[PDB]
Design a binder for this molecule. Structure first.
Ligand SMILES: O=C(O)CCC(=O)C(=O)O
Ligand SMILES: [Mn+2]
Length: 321
């Protein structure tokens, strides 16, 4: 298409890394015109409960916004060293299992899909195709119907309570105290994958914010207007980065035109080199990651991005209509 968004989506899909092509992409980790401050409520989440999600204390968090996009909040990586591996491990291993609908279910059964993890262990032994490599989305909580474009009181699997915990802290720190993680879409990217221009319009309550977690390889994110004519702003999303779309930003058109290969070759971003600590807190929502688990996760994220996206579908007591 020739309308501003599709033009730019096209440009960044076909962008060449390590050239002048990415000059206009904002990097929140490292421009100065558009990027602005954003206060987080620091006393909201305790130093102990941030510890339980694998997060730094909220006091340590950098948090930015954008000129022209009120309500858009961008953390950088808050996560403690190593703790990104638990969340990446859940998204591949636990969350994709059934119950809890993945994209492989349209043309396979519970027979074929049930040993996605064990198969990908077997790909470790075969040094020098797979189910994990075909996985593109998983839903949790209220399952989004891609065809109907609706949620339903019928189609739901209890939200993962550890992910619901991480969600609540991130929500509260951004000034969203009574946030209920009711619905989850997870997205899995190869280096050639893209997510098309869309608006996350089919939750019923548009007060409540949209949480967008990111892990592994970097991606470009286009955030645009209320209609697709308007040209978007490009920004990088790095491993561990978090994105709230709240207020005016909630119902904005956005996309991911590109996932990017590591600049220094193949291999992981530097932040993911640190492993999970052996000593984990007594009361934690994070669970020890085995040696084999880390190895599958590690080899996958060398050429993949995983995104988690946590939403509230119904107002605090808007029983399903
Ligand atoms: O992968 C991303 O960061 C985009 C996720 C998203 O917009 C969605 O799934 O609604
Ligand atoms: Mn979206």
């Amino acid at each position: 298409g020739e309308d501003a968004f599709r033009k730019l989506f096209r440009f960044y899909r076909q962008s060449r890394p390590g050239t002048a092509d990415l000059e206009g992409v904002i990097d929140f980790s490292a421009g100065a015109q558009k990027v602005i401050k954003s206060q987080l409520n620091v006393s909201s989440v305790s130093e102990q409960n941030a510890y339980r999600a694998g997060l730094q204390p909220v006091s340590k968090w950098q948090a930015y916004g954008l000129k022209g996009y009120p309500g858009f909040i961008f953390i950088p990586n808050p996560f403690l060293p190593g703790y990104q591996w638990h969340w990446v491990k859940q998204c591949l291993k636990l969350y994709s299992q059934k119950p809890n609908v993945c994209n492989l279910d349209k043309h396979m059964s519970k027979e074929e899909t049930q040993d996605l993890w064990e198969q990908s262990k077997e790909f470790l032994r075969y040094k020098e195709r797979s189910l994990l490599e075909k996985l593109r989305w998983v839903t949790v909580g209220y399952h989004y119907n891609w065809d109907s474009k609706k949620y339903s009181a019928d189609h739901y699997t209890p939200f993962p309570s550890d992910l619901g915990f991480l969600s609540e802290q991130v929500a509260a720190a951004c000034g969203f105290e009574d946030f209920r993680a009711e619905a989850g879409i997870l997205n899995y990217y190869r280096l050639d994958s893209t997510l098309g221009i869309h608006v996350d319009r089919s939750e019923l309550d548009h007060s409540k914010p949209l949480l967008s977690f990111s892990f592994g390889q970097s991606a470009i994110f286009l955030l645009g207007g209320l209609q697709r004519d308007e040209a978007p702003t490009a920004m990088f999303m790095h491993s561990g980065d978090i994105m709230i779309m709240s207020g005016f930003s909630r119902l904005l058109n956005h996309a991911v035109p590109r996932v990017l290969p590591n600049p220094e070759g193949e291999g992981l971003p530097h932040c993911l080199e640190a492993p999970l600590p052996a000593v984990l807190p007594r009361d934690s929502m994070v669970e020890p990651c085995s040696m084999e688990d880390w190895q599958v996760c590690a080899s996958y994220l060398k050429t993949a991005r995983v995104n988690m996206t946590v939403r509230q579908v119904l107002a605090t007591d808007q029983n399903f209509p």
